[PDB]
Amino acid sequence: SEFARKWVPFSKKYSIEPRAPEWYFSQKIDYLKDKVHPSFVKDRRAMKREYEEFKVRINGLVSKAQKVPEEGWVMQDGTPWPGNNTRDHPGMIQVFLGQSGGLDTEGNELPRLVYVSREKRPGFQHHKKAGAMNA
Amino acid sequence: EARQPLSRKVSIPSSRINPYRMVIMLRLVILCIFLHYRITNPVPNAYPLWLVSVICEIWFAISWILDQFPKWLPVNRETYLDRLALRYDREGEPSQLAAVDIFVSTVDPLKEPPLVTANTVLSILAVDYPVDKVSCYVSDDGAAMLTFEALAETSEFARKWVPFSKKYSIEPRAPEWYFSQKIDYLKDKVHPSFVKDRRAMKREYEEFKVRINGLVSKAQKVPEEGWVMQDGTPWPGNNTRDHPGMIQVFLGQSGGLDTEGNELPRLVYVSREKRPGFQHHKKAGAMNALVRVSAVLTNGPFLLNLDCDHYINNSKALREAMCFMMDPNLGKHVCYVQFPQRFDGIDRNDRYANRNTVFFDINLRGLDGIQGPVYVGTGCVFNRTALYGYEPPLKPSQMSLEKRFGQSAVFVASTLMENGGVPQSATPETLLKEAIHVISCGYEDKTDWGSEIGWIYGSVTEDILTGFKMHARGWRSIYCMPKRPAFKGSAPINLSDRLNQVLRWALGSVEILFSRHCPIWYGYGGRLKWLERFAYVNTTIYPVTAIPLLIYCILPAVCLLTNKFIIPQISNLASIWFISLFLSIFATGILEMRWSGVGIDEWWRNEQFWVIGGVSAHLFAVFQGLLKVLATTLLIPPTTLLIINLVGVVAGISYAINSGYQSWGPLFGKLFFAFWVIIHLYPFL
Ligand SMILES: OC[C@H]1O[C@@H](O[C@H]2[C@H](O)[C@@H](O)[C@H](O)O[C@@H]2CO)[C@H](O)[C@@H](O)[C@@H]1O
């Protein structure tokens, strides 16, 4: 969401296809085709560098999360992660971007993004993807 | 002391060409013996299948003799750039090199992308030649505003692109092809400040491409009220069919300065006047108008012709041309210098045979040793005197000039300048008016333009006619083959374009055949070499060969269906000649390979491509030419023919099932013949 805060205005303004940064920046197709805006090259270079830094940050997060701590996961706020036990965790819902989630680089709004994890308890069936879709 | 020639004609050493000639003589003798046998020992009586076969064999032998004769004296040419630089381009003194005017032909910005033309102009403006001795003229036949705006933007970008390429000596100097090369760009680089300059130049080129794309997008939609200039005045070329003549100069003496404070080569955009109901002769008329405008403005002694899709790959091409043009002993008798046509991005297998290395490495090399290569359009440097119709010097009148050239006194006076250039005290405001006058639509009336001088008019490809007319006066042409190709272009992507251009070439050839300029009788008693005339007849009457070939291609199928073979009963006295003839053909192919380095792949591709052309496009061109004289589908005959052969093959084996003891022998010979035909017809179909 933090990276989208700056990625979305670029793709919306320059109408790039595809809008997934991994596949857009890894295409051998000439990226200067049907481009009119005079300020496109520098913006594209800055966006590419920002995406590389974002990928580095994601790799760092994955490397940190690779090792499971003995005392359990702890949030950045300091409270323990409620989903410490996958089989016996409650339900959590978090909203990152939306009406009050913040503004992008152009001062507009961003589509609402919600992270949900349904409650899991031992001995209860969950039906996997069908139950996830219903929830 | 300073008498060493600027160039040398190297004869092919007597270790490959002599075996080649001996093998040609042996093949001629064996062809004569085989045909003498074929005339005798007829097929059993009452079989008309043999007369057609021997007639076709006779025609094939005559065609092969006619094609092989102008290949006896191949020569190469080696240039001394250092001697030319020392003799003329001396350091600390003004350059004495002759001025050059480079013409660039374009017609439609929609069909021809403006980026390619911009890259061509950028490569031309960065040539390794003095800026005061280089002029560039771009002829846009469509009178499009997009071309004018693209040329202005191209000049603006060249203002910074030229110093970079000149300083760092990059190759090629076209930014599109230089920046899109996988070759290590840090090779043979010494200057400490090259990396940052290259990065800045790459970014600037990307921004320039973005600007060009924006201009194209703007010009895509035609406004209802018509195009309007940035100044606010309406675009004069609003109607393509009814627009007047316009000439604009972007860079030059007063066009501005580059990033280093020097000058830039002069760039002129010209569009000849177009009016309804008047013929314009397309590229020939455009070239003639360009020649007249350049004579009025700069009057350069030499003119380099180029299309929009061909860029200068080697920056020293002009020096290579001047090595022949400016030689005191040789330059007096030279009409034009021709460079081989090379295309980038060609398929590695080269299905379409777009490379055409046999014509540019064997045919033209052999032609250079007699009188010179034939004119092929792009990438040629012409002398003004030869273009004007003057005869070459022999080796030991106001009304006439007005009638021959035109009613423009300034142009006639310029034609009399032995060293070129424009006379002093000529006001540029009057030079522009004179150039506009000579570019008018109704100028080439009652004159020799397009009939005896300049680009010769007609519905033909026209690049053979002009060179042949120049050669008929005794002029000598030079074939230059630098190690690095001088110019590079783009090959057709689809087979449709290749077939269409082959059909166009064959139609032009058959049109030349039924015309006054046909080499058989035109120029008789002149200063044209007999072997050169033989080669011209060879390259002129070639598509007629299509008519027997088709018949011969029909010969196996009937031979399979009728159950009779073309040759009589097999005999050892005959089989020896057959096998020895086949071996002679293979040996002469091998030797033609070894002395030229063409390769077995390209040689076999050229053979099968000659077959497919004769059966596909040459046949249609001959039919259309005969219809015109008397008064896709191009792929339809040979496919059918191929299918017919295939069908016949199946039928053949059926007869075997019937006849038992007669399954081998004659049927095997028929299958061998059918396999030979279909393997010649293997590509495409
Ligand atoms: O290739 C340019 C040149 O081709 C001429 O036809 C050639 C043909 O290209 C080549 O493959 C064949 O072997 O010989 C013929 C001889 O005409 C064509 O006539 C020219 O207009 C064209 O510029």
Coordinates of C-alpha atoms in Angstrom, one line a residue, chain B residues 171-547:
Chain B
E171 CA 29.8 3.9 -35.6
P172 CA 27.1 3.8 -36.9
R173 CA 26.2 7.5 -36.5
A174 CA 22.4 6.9 -36.6
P175 CA 21.2 7.2 -33.0
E176 CA 18.6 4.5 -33.3
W177 CA 21.0 1.8 -34.5
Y178 CA 23.9 3.0 -32.4
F179 CA 21.9 2.8 -29.1
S180 CA 20.3 -0.5 -30.0
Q181 CA 23.4 -2.6 -30.5
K182 CA 24.5 -5.5 -28.2
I183 CA 28.1 -4.9 -29.1
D184 CA 30.2 -3.7 -26.1
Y185 CA 30.1 0.1 -26.4
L186 CA 33.2 0.6 -24.2
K187 CA 35.5 -0.9 -26.7
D188 CA 38.4 1.2 -28.0
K189 CA 37.4 4.2 -25.9
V190 CA 40.1 6.4 -24.4
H191 CA 38.5 9.7 -23.5
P192 CA 37.9 9.9 -19.7
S193 CA 34.6 11.9 -20.2
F194 CA 32.9 9.4 -22.5
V195 CA 30.5 7.6 -20.1
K196 CA 28.7 10.6 -18.8
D197 CA 28.5 12.1 -22.3
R198 CA 27.1 8.9 -23.7
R199 CA 24.5 8.7 -20.9
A200 CA 23.4 12.3 -21.5
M201 CA 23.2 11.7 -25.2
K202 CA 21.1 8.5 -24.7
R203 CA 18.7 10.4 -22.5
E204 CA 18.5 13.3 -24.9
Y205 CA 17.8 10.9 -27.8
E206 CA 15.0 9.3 -25.8
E207 CA 13.4 12.7 -25.2
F208 CA 13.8 13.5 -28.9
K209 CA 12.0 10.2 -29.8
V210 CA 9.2 11.1 -27.3
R211 CA 8.9 14.5 -29.0
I212 CA 8.7 12.9 -32.5
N213 CA 6.1 10.4 -31.3
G214 CA 4.0 13.4 -30.0
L215 CA 4.4 15.2 -33.3
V216 CA 3.2 12.0 -35.1
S217 CA 0.3 11.6 -32.8
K218 CA -0.7 15.2 -33.4
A219 CA -0.4 14.9 -37.1
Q220 CA -2.4 11.6 -37.2
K221 CA -5.8 13.5 -37.1
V222 CA -6.5 15.7 -40.1
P223 CA -8.2 18.9 -39.0
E224 CA -11.4 20.0 -40.7
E225 CA -10.2 23.5 -41.4
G226 CA -6.8 22.4 -42.6
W227 CA -3.3 22.4 -41.2
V228 CA -1.9 25.6 -39.7
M229 CA 1.7 26.5 -39.1
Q230 CA 3.1 27.4 -35.7
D231 CA 3.4 31.0 -37.0
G232 CA -0.3 31.0 -37.6
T233 CA -0.4 31.1 -41.4
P234 CA -2.1 28.1 -43.2
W235 CA 0.1 25.3 -44.5
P236 CA 0.6 25.9 -48.2
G237 CA 0.6 22.1 -48.9
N238 CA -3.0 21.7 -47.7
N239 CA -4.0 19.9 -50.9
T240 CA -1.4 17.3 -52.0
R241 CA -2.5 17.4 -55.6
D242 CA -2.8 21.2 -55.9
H243 CA 0.0 22.7 -53.9
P244 CA 2.8 25.1 -55.0
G245 CA 6.5 24.7 -54.5
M246 CA 8.2 25.4 -51.2
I247 CA 11.9 25.4 -50.2
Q248 CA 13.2 25.8 -46.6
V249 CA 16.7 25.8 -45.2
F250 CA 17.2 24.8 -41.6
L251 CA 20.9 24.6 -40.9
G252 CA 23.8 26.1 -42.8
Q253 CA 26.0 29.1 -42.7
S254 CA 23.4 31.2 -40.8
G255 CA 21.3 28.3 -39.5
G256 CA 23.0 28.4 -36.1
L257 CA 25.8 26.8 -34.1
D258 CA 26.1 23.4 -32.4
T259 CA 27.1 22.7 -28.8
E260 CA 30.8 23.2 -29.7
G261 CA 30.3 26.5 -31.5
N262 CA 31.1 25.2 -35.0
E263 CA 28.9 25.0 -38.0
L264 CA 26.6 22.3 -39.3
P265 CA 26.1 20.9 -42.8
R266 CA 23.4 22.7 -44.8
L267 CA 19.9 21.1 -44.7
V268 CA 17.3 22.0 -47.2
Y269 CA 13.6 20.8 -47.4
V270 CA 12.1 21.0 -50.9
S271 CA 8.7 20.1 -52.2
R272 CA 8.1 20.5 -56.0
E273 CA 5.0 22.1 -57.3
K274 CA 2.1 19.8 -57.9
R275 CA -0.9 20.7 -60.1
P276 CA -3.9 18.6 -61.2
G277 CA -3.7 16.9 -64.6
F278 CA 0.1 17.2 -64.9
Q279 CA 2.3 14.1 -64.8
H280 CA 5.2 14.1 -62.4
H281 CA 7.0 10.8 -63.1
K282 CA 7.4 10.1 -59.3
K283 CA 11.0 9.4 -58.2
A284 CA 12.6 10.3 -61.5
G285 CA 11.0 13.7 -61.5
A286 CA 11.7 14.2 -57.8
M287 CA 15.4 13.4 -58.5
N288 CA 15.5 15.8 -61.5
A289 CA 14.0 18.6 -59.4
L290 CA 16.4 17.9 -56.6
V291 CA 19.3 18.1 -59.1
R292 CA 18.1 21.4 -60.4
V293 CA 17.6 22.9 -57.0
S294 CA 21.0 21.8 -55.8
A295 CA 22.6 23.2 -58.9
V296 CA 20.8 26.5 -58.2
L297 CA 21.8 26.6 -54.5
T298 CA 25.1 24.8 -54.0
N299 CA 26.1 23.2 -57.4
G300 CA 28.0 20.4 -55.8
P301 CA 30.1 18.4 -58.3
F302 CA 28.9 15.0 -56.9
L303 CA 25.5 13.8 -55.8
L304 CA 24.8 10.9 -53.4
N305 CA 21.3 9.4 -53.8
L306 CA 19.5 7.8 -50.9
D307 CA 16.1 6.6 -49.8
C308 CA 14.5 7.3 -46.4
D309 CA 15.2 3.8 -45.0
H310 CA 18.9 3.7 -45.9
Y311 CA 21.4 5.2 -43.4
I312 CA 25.1 5.9 -43.7
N313 CA 26.6 3.0 -41.8
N314 CA 30.3 3.9 -42.5
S315 CA 31.0 7.6 -41.9
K316 CA 34.0 7.5 -44.4
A317 CA 31.8 6.5 -47.3
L318 CA 32.2 9.9 -48.9
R319 CA 36.0 9.7 -48.7
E320 CA 35.9 6.2 -50.3
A321 CA 33.8 7.6 -53.1
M322 CA 36.2 10.6 -53.6
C323 CA 39.1 8.1 -53.8
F324 CA 37.7 7.2 -57.2
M325 CA 35.9 10.4 -58.1
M326 CA 38.8 12.8 -57.5
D327 CA 41.6 10.7 -59.0
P328 CA 43.1 12.9 -61.8
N329 CA 43.7 9.9 -64.1
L330 CA 40.5 8.0 -63.4
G331 CA 38.0 10.6 -62.2
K332 CA 37.6 12.1 -65.7
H333 CA 36.1 8.9 -67.1
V334 CA 34.0 7.9 -64.1
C335 CA 30.2 8.5 -64.2
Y336 CA 29.1 7.0 -60.9
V337 CA 30.3 4.9 -57.9
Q338 CA 28.0 2.2 -56.7
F339 CA 28.0 0.6 -53.2
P340 CA 26.5 -2.8 -52.4
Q341 CA 23.1 -2.8 -50.8
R342 CA 23.2 -4.3 -47.3
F343 CA 20.1 -4.8 -45.0
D344 CA 20.1 -5.2 -41.3
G345 CA 17.8 -7.5 -39.3
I346 CA 17.6 -10.1 -42.1
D347 CA 16.6 -13.5 -41.0
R348 CA 19.5 -15.8 -40.3
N349 CA 18.1 -18.5 -42.5
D350 CA 16.9 -15.8 -44.9
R351 CA 13.8 -17.5 -46.3
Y352 CA 13.1 -14.7 -48.7
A353 CA 16.8 -14.5 -49.8
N354 CA 16.7 -10.8 -49.0
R355 CA 20.5 -10.8 -48.7
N356 CA 20.9 -11.5 -52.4
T357 CA 24.7 -11.8 -51.9
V358 CA 25.1 -13.6 -55.3
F359 CA 24.0 -10.6 -57.3
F360 CA 26.1 -8.1 -55.2
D361 CA 29.2 -10.4 -54.9
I362 CA 29.4 -12.3 -58.2
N363 CA 27.3 -10.5 -60.8
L364 CA 28.4 -6.9 -59.9
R365 CA 32.0 -8.0 -59.2
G366 CA 32.2 -9.5 -62.7
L367 CA 30.5 -6.5 -64.2
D368 CA 33.0 -4.2 -62.5
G369 CA 35.8 -5.8 -64.5
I370 CA 34.3 -5.0 -67.9
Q371 CA 32.8 -1.5 -67.7
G372 CA 31.4 -1.2 -64.1
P373 CA 28.3 -2.1 -62.0
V374 CA 24.8 -1.3 -63.0
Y375 CA 22.9 1.4 -61.2
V376 CA 20.6 0.0 -58.5
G377 CA 19.1 3.1 -57.0
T378 CA 20.1 3.9 -53.4
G379 CA 23.7 4.3 -52.3
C380 CA 25.2 5.8 -55.5
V381 CA 27.4 8.8 -56.1
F382 CA 26.9 10.5 -59.5
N383 CA 29.0 12.9 -61.4
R384 CA 27.3 16.1 -62.5
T385 CA 28.8 16.1 -66.0
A386 CA 27.8 12.5 -66.7
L387 CA 24.3 13.3 -65.4
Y388 CA 24.0 16.3 -67.7
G389 CA 24.5 14.1 -70.8
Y390 CA 28.0 15.2 -71.7
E391 CA 30.3 12.6 -73.3
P392 CA 33.4 11.5 -71.4
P393 CA 36.8 12.8 -72.7
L394 CA 38.3 10.7 -75.5
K395 CA 41.3 8.6 -74.5
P396 CA 44.3 9.0 -76.9
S397 CA 25.6 27.5 -78.4
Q398 CA 23.3 29.3 -76.0
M399 CA 20.2 28.1 -77.8
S400 CA 21.4 24.5 -77.6
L401 CA 22.0 24.8 -73.9
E402 CA 18.6 26.5 -73.4
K403 CA 16.8 23.7 -75.4
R404 CA 18.7 20.9 -73.6
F405 CA 18.3 22.1 -70.0
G406 CA 15.6 24.7 -69.8
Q407 CA 14.6 28.4 -69.7
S408 CA 16.4 29.1 -66.4
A409 CA 19.5 31.2 -67.2
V410 CA 20.9 30.7 -63.7
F411 CA 20.9 26.9 -64.0
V412 CA 22.5 27.1 -67.5
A413 CA 25.2 29.4 -66.1
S414 CA 25.8 27.0 -63.2
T415 CA 26.1 24.1 -65.5
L416 CA 29.2 25.8 -67.1
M417 CA 31.0 26.0 -63.7
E418 CA 33.9 23.6 -64.0
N419 CA 34.7 23.6 -60.2
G420 CA 31.1 23.8 -59.1
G421 CA 29.8 26.3 -56.5
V422 CA 27.7 29.4 -57.0
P423 CA 29.1 32.7 -58.3
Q424 CA 29.6 35.5 -55.9
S425 CA 27.4 38.7 -55.7
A426 CA 24.4 36.3 -55.8
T427 CA 21.8 37.5 -53.3
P428 CA 20.3 34.5 -51.3
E429 CA 16.9 36.2 -51.6
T430 CA 17.2 35.9 -55.4
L431 CA 18.7 32.4 -55.2
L432 CA 15.6 31.2 -53.4
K433 CA 13.4 32.7 -56.0
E434 CA 15.4 31.1 -58.8
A435 CA 15.3 27.7 -57.0
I436 CA 11.5 28.1 -56.7
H437 CA 11.3 28.9 -60.4
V438 CA 13.3 25.9 -61.5
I439 CA 11.1 23.6 -59.3
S440 CA 7.9 24.6 -61.0
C441 CA 5.7 21.8 -62.4
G442 CA 5.7 23.1 -66.0
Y443 CA 9.5 23.5 -66.3
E444 CA 10.6 20.3 -68.0
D445 CA 8.8 21.1 -71.3
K446 CA 10.5 21.0 -74.7
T447 CA 13.7 19.9 -72.8
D448 CA 15.8 16.7 -72.6
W449 CA 15.0 16.1 -68.9
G450 CA 13.8 12.6 -68.4
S451 CA 14.6 11.5 -72.0
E452 CA 18.3 12.1 -72.6
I453 CA 19.7 13.6 -69.4
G454 CA 19.2 13.0 -65.7
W455 CA 16.9 10.3 -64.4
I456 CA 15.2 8.8 -67.5
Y457 CA 11.5 8.8 -67.3
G458 CA 9.2 5.8 -67.7
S459 CA 7.1 3.2 -65.9
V460 CA 10.2 1.1 -65.3
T461 CA 12.3 0.7 -62.1
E462 CA 14.3 3.4 -63.9
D463 CA 17.6 2.7 -62.1
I464 CA 18.8 0.4 -65.0
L465 CA 17.8 2.8 -67.7
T466 CA 19.8 5.8 -66.4
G467 CA 23.0 3.7 -65.9
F468 CA 22.6 2.0 -69.2
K469 CA 22.2 5.4 -71.0
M470 CA 25.3 6.7 -69.2
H471 CA 27.2 3.6 -70.2
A472 CA 26.1 3.9 -73.9
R473 CA 28.1 7.1 -74.1
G474 CA 31.4 5.4 -73.0
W475 CA 31.3 6.3 -69.3
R476 CA 33.0 4.0 -66.8
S477 CA 31.4 3.1 -63.5
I478 CA 33.1 2.0 -60.3
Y479 CA 32.1 -0.6 -57.8
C480 CA 33.3 0.2 -54.3
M481 CA 33.2 -2.5 -51.6
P482 CA 34.5 -1.2 -48.2
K483 CA 35.1 -3.7 -45.4
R484 CA 32.5 -1.9 -43.3
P485 CA 29.3 -1.4 -45.4
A486 CA 28.8 2.2 -46.4
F487 CA 25.0 2.2 -46.2
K488 CA 22.5 -0.1 -44.5
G489 CA 18.7 -0.5 -44.9
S490 CA 15.7 -2.6 -43.8
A491 CA 14.6 -5.7 -45.7
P492 CA 10.9 -6.5 -46.3
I493 CA 9.3 -8.4 -43.4
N494 CA 6.6 -10.3 -45.2
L495 CA 6.9 -12.4 -48.4
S496 CA 4.1 -10.3 -50.0
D497 CA 6.4 -7.3 -50.3
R498 CA 9.3 -9.4 -51.7
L499 CA 7.0 -11.0 -54.3
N500 CA 5.6 -7.6 -55.2
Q501 CA 9.1 -6.1 -55.7
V502 CA 10.3 -9.1 -57.7
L503 CA 7.2 -8.7 -59.9
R504 CA 7.9 -5.0 -60.2
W505 CA 11.5 -5.7 -61.3
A506 CA 10.5 -8.2 -63.9
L507 CA 7.8 -5.9 -65.2
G508 CA 10.4 -3.2 -65.5
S509 CA 12.7 -5.5 -67.4
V510 CA 10.1 -6.7 -69.8
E511 CA 9.1 -3.0 -70.3
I512 CA 12.7 -2.3 -71.1
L513 CA 12.7 -5.1 -73.6
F514 CA 9.8 -3.5 -75.6
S515 CA 11.3 0.0 -75.6
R516 CA 13.7 2.1 -77.6
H517 CA 16.4 1.8 -74.9
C518 CA 16.6 -2.0 -75.3
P519 CA 20.2 -3.1 -75.3
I520 CA 19.9 -5.4 -78.3
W521 CA 20.0 -2.5 -80.9
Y522 CA 20.1 0.7 -78.9
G523 CA 23.6 2.3 -78.8
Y524 CA 24.9 0.3 -81.8
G525 CA 28.2 1.7 -83.0
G526 CA 28.7 3.7 -79.8
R527 CA 31.3 3.5 -77.1
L528 CA 29.7 0.6 -75.2
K529 CA 31.7 -2.6 -74.7
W530 CA 30.4 -5.7 -76.3
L531 CA 30.6 -7.7 -73.1
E532 CA 28.8 -4.9 -71.3
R533 CA 26.1 -5.1 -73.9
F534 CA 25.9 -8.9 -73.5
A535 CA 25.5 -8.4 -69.7
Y536 CA 22.8 -5.8 -70.3
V537 CA 20.9 -8.1 -72.6
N538 CA 21.3 -10.8 -69.9
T539 CA 19.8 -8.6 -67.2
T540 CA 17.1 -7.4 -69.6
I541 CA 15.6 -10.5 -71.3
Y542 CA 15.9 -12.7 -68.2
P543 CA 12.1 -13.1 -67.3
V544 CA 11.4 -14.4 -70.8
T545 CA 13.2 -17.6 -69.6
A546 CA 10.1 -18.1 -67.4
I547 CA 8.1 -19.4 -70.4

